[PDB]
Design a protein around this ligand. Structure first.
Ligand code: NA
Ligand code: NA
Lengths: 389, 385
């Protein structure tokens, strides 16, 4: 449950039983040949794995430095890496004998991923979403409706994500016998940080094989955006024991690190307990959890996964920040230069990789995790483009 | 040029020259080692080929008939088969020394596909679009602008697709030396029907290898939706000389074939010369081209590919139709049962494959071409709810 001094299981006794049951079931299935055959079968035929490793020739030549490769998670069924974890936990729940899936979502991406995985495996899906988020995300709610899921509008409290998490936990305590709580990032109490990283590690394993086949050598740098940290841990984990492979996590710098309007937990956060884990969280002068900000909804989270807290502490990974403006510039640049519209989350990683490439040799290799496609973000980018001049 | 008694190059002499130059170039490159190496490289690393063949276990089981496999073109970069042809023609153009691509679009889909391919290969992209259509598809116009393409708005005449085609054709007549006219379906004058089919034939070749891996036998039936006919020709062509394999195109039945609001050209159309080809077109009592209808914008074409007319004539492939309602039924059904939101176009093919599955036995196999994903069609589906 620990990554050095980070992680744990800081939950009420009511949640201890369910988590213990999950850990035991995972220990059985994680190395079980049939579980892995079915998972790999669904990832191949339903999700379209493997995703390609793409050499961004035009972007690389424009910068005039390091070769920039994009791990094309944008091409996974659903348009985001989140599908990898949604399939894994849904199949685990079904093989555990669960009949129902519950999850929470703010912007809807995890909700859609969960709804999709549920439909595939013929399980019931209830997604907890704040009614304020429901009114903001009409298409994603319709999507979840289409996929045979019920969006439970959370009218209580702030009608936000926090309230949906509380209602989802309260649901799970009562229903854990037949219901599985599908967490969408490497966050929360053990064993969720480990399970989600294990179900995203396929990104790194493909990327390693693909760069070795294409370039006959390991990458110099791997760059991934870090919200909770699942896409980053996914591409990082298989390279951790490759000492000369630099690992760079890019957090949401928002309106700037000095503005207090960002989600850079590792950069500016303090070590403390929240959402059942010991990790870095954005805190006010008192020590209360400070609200976060990013133009990218997927990065807009006050906390970060404990394994990233560990990788920072042992200095195995460097953690940096890119601003809303820098991410928007990278969104436009990749679109026009390579004909790939990135998720605004992924655009944070593209933004930092473009800066790093300029200072590096043409023989050096950067792999960027392109965690998703930016179709979902077109309204946000249009509004920001209309606010110019 | 000819598929039996259909096809041709029925164009003014201004267009004959450029089309003849395109014929020569395609002949020089179609089997060229380097062109095919680059095309396969872009299809693999950029578009994400090969696309998987998915066994819809739950759909197969609830029907209680033939095993239904889905060729997942919905997973291609851009979310539709159109990308395969966009990359092919865009690369051919670049290797021909063309610096520019032009196209026209009404819904915006072919415009986006062309804009994406042009961006990849570092070519100028101008998309002719009727000012009316521009207003109706603001996000697809934004997409094209994001991808570095210029949307040249056509306010001349009705500000529709017809006007945009004329302006684009006038452009290519002038600019063919440095510009390639990118056609998105197996329609218009030679060599476009043959080129677009050859750049979509990858779908059927992959499907054949994949079905032989999964089942150790060829499929009994292959079902594909037919608008102009590119995705259907793509999955059909490699199985044409496999006599035992049945080929079914599903045209848009619309509000009904009797209602006069449909796009089933091969069904209720008549032979005529329009858009530079001899094929089946929807015609009124005057002989004038009747307006098409389909809830699926991609199937909303009064015309059809000349190679489908040939396959209909020689009875190598059957051509059926499915209503707007049956398609919406299949859109919801695949979404809820298999967790794949299909394009309304692709939903037509799913709908008939569900009917034809019931008729056949459990040991028999249907491959359905899932030509695209339905993210683009969500607003249309909500409106019809
Ligand atoms: Na954070
Ligand atoms: Na038609």
């Amino acid at each position: 449950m620990w990554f050095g001094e980070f992680g744990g299981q800081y939950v009420p006794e009511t949640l201890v039983g369910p988590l213990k049951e999950l850990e035991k079931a995972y220990k059985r299935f994680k190395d079980d040949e049939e579980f892995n055959r079915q998972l790999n079968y669904y990832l191949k035929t339903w999700a379209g794995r493997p995703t390609p490793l793409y050499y961004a020739k035009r972007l690389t030549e424009k910068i005039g430095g390091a070769k920039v490769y994009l791990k094309r998670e944008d091409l996974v069924h659903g348009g985001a890496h989140k599908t990898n974890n949604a399939i894994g936990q849904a199949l685990l729940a079904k093989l555990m004998g669960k009949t129902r899936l519950i999850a929470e979502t703010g912007a809807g991406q995890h909700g859609v991923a969960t709804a999709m995985a549920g439909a595939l495996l013929g399980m019931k899906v209830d997604i907890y979403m704040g009614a304020e988020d429901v009114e903001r995300q009409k298409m994603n709610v319709f999507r979840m409706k289409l996929l045979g899921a019920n969006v439970i509008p959370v009218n209580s409290g702030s009608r936000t994500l926090k309230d949906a998490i509380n209602e989802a936990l309260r649901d799970w305590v009562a229903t854990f016998e037949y219901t599985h709580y599908l967490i969408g990032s490497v966050v929360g109490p053990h064993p969720y940080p480990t399970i989600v990283r294990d179900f995203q590690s396929v990104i790194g394993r493909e990327a390693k094989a693909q760069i070795l086949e294409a370039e006959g050598q390991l990458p110099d740098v791997i760059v991934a955006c870090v919200g909770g940290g699942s896409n980053a841990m996914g591409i990082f984990y298989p390279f951790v024991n490759d000492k000369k492979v630099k690992l760079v996590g890019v957090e949401a710098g928002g309106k700037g690190l000095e503005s207090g309007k960002h989600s850079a937990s590792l950069n500016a956060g303090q070590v403390g307990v929240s959402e059942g884990m010991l990790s870095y969280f954005l805190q006010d002068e008192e020590g209360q959890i400070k609200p976060s900000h990013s133009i990218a909804p997927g990065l807009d989270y006050p906390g970060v996964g404990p394994e990233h807290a560990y990788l920072k502490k042992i200095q195995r990974a460097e953690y940096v920040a890119v601003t809303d403006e820098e991410a928007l510039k990278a969104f436009h640049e990749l679109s026009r230069t390579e004909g790939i519209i990135p998720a605004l989350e992924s655009a944070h990683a593209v933004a930092y990789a473009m800066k790093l490439a300029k200072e590096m040799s043409r023989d050096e290799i950067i792999i960027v995790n392109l965690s998703g496609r930016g179709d979902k973000d077109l309204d946000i980018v249009l509004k920001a483009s209309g606010n110019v001049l």
